[PDB]
Amino acid sequence: RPWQMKDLQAIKQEVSQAAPGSPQFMQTIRLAVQQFDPTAKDLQDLLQYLCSSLVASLHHQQLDSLISEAETRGITGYNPLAGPLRVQANNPQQQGLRREYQQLWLAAFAALP
What we know:
This protein is mainly α. The chain has 6 helices and no strands. The chain has helices at about 5-15, 25-35, 40-50, 55-75, 85-90, 95-110. It is found in: Virion.
């Protein structure tokens, strides 16, 4: 049950005025992420739709650092012999990795301003 075009259109329109990482944007994006239960691929699509290449790159770097610390510590469900967290989160049998990816994503995007 992935999102459709209308959901993305509404998500972008409702937060057109606000700035990335504002409390309003964080509310709406967090609700979307917690409601649709998407993988990393869909999150990348959503970010490309919402913010430009500059904000995309900044979030990419911040999320790289956050994932770096998180999975360098060692995580309950992460096994580094199978692939990067971006790929484990895309397997529907690793929901723990998917939820960790979602939370790192939202925190990284909130850490912009």
